[PDB]
Amino acid sequence: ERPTFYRQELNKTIWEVPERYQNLSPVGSGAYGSVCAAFDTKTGLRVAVKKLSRPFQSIIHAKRTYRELRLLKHMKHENVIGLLDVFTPARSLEEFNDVYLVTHLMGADLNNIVKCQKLTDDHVQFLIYQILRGLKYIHSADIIHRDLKPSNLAVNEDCELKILDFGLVATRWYRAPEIMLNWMHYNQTVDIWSVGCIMAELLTGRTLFPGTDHIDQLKLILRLVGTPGAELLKKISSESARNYIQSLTQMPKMNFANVFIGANPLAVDLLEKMLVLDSDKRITAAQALAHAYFAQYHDPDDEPVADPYDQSFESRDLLIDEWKSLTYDEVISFVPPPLDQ
Ligand SMILES: O=c1c(Br)c(OCc2ccccc2)ccn1Cc1ccccc1
Numbered sequence: 001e002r003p004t005f006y007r008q009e010l011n012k013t014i015w016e017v018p019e020r021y022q023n024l025s026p027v028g029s030g031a032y033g034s035v036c037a038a039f040d041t042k043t044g045l046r047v048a049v050k051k052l053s054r055p056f057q058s059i060i061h062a063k064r065t066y067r068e069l070r071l072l073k074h075m076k077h078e079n080v081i082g083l084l085d086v087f088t089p090a091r092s093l094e095e096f097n098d099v100y101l102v103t104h105l106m107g108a109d110l111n112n113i114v115k116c117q118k119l120t121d122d123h124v125q126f127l128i129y130q131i132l133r134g135l136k137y138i139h140s141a142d143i144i145h146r147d148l149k150p151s152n153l154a155v156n157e158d159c160e161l162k163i164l165d166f167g168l169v170a171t172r173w174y175r176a177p178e179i180m181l182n183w184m185h186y187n188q189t190v191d192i193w194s195v196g197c198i199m200a201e202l203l204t205g206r207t208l209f210p211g212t213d214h215i216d217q218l219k220l221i222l223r224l225v226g227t228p229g230a231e232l233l234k235k236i237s238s239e240s241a242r243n244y245i246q247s248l249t250q251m252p253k254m255n256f257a258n259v260f261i262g263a264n265p266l267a268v269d270l271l272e273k274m275l276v277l278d279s280d281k282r283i284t285a286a287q288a289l290a291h292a293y294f295a296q297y298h299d300p301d302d303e304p305v306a307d308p309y310d311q312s313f314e315s316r317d318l319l320i321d322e323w324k325s326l327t328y329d330e331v332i333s334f335v336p337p338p339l340d341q
């Protein structure tokens with residue numbers, strides 16, 4: 001049966017939510033919606049409530065809305081953001097024009113933490129372990145995140161971490177070189193690249209590759225990791241890309257031990273493995289969890305994999321009303337997870 005809703009305006013946005021959620025307080029905005037912190041009276045915990053902006057504005061928005069709901073309904077892992085609740089104030093499909101999502105409030109991200117801070121090795125171990133543990137799960141569902149950066153890593157006062165969906169500086173800074181090149185057959189290790197860039201920054205206090213644009217970004221990456229060797233060169237189909245790359249002044253892969261000088265040598269070894277230029281040679285999330293850098297955290301029996309995830313809708317070309325109806329179906333069928341201390 002339907003709960004009682006109440007309406008309010010927060011920052012020129014209307015929020016209509018069940019009375020169970022109290023003390024809404026805006027925390028930010030992330031392209032596809034706005035977020036408020038709230039108090040969940042049913043559990044006594046603080047939650048983040050996201051209101052999707054214009055969910056059915058176009059086929060793109062409608063499919064994006066469906067995609068996010070499907071993804072968040074599927075993610076059930078300690079280090080990945082999932083759903084406590086999904087609701088709409090709409091009492092019918094024709095009424096349906098707003099989607100709210102709720103998750104447990106972590107309360108900060110790594111954008112907030114990195115800033116004015118170099119971290120000790122022990123905290124970097126724990127943070128990056130958690131990221132990799134979440135990534136192992138995501139990758140096992142044959143999902144690629146594609147946009148991992150500090151703002152997409154939500155962290156609580158205990159330094160427990162969950163991977164966000166979408167977060168609240170430059171995104172290109174964390175992006176794999178093959179994506180800057182525009183390769184359409186990139187793999188899951190694009191996310192491993194991002195984690196390498198994030199880990200590097202946590203250890204040093206500086207952006208590993210602060211490119212001003214995609215070209216600058218590629219150039220900074222190749223200065224650290226070297227211009228492509230022959231094995232990699234042969235895998236590049238594009239004539240313009242290969243002409244460009246091979247016309248650059250050719251560069252050796254740097255010794256990372258020299259670059260990340262003060263760092264724990266196990267940290268440098270993992271970084272070398274994460275940031276190999278040829279993506280076919282980069283370490284996987286599962287492999288990284290078994291690396292000696294994480295010896296004090298790694299438990300192979302507590303690093304679970306995801307249930308099968310149906311991404312077939314991704315190929316489909318549907319009407320806005322069809323995406324809308326499917327999303328509505330997904331809201332109605334939502335089963336919350338159980339309360340457990
Ligand atoms: O801890 C979170 C969570 Br938790 C978020 O969740 C967004 C969300 C909400 C509902 C569904 C899916 C995602 C977003 C940012 N942050 C970090 C953050 C929270 C409050 C202030 C600053 C940073």
Ligand SMILES: Fc1ccc(-c2c[nH]nc2-c2ccnc(F)c2)cc1
Nearest residue numbers: 177178183235236237245277278279
């Ligand atoms: F300057 C470069 C050259 C190659 C890469 C690269 C890294 N991993 N995979 C690739 C790749 C494979 C096949 N085709 C591509 F276009 C790219 C990245 C930057």
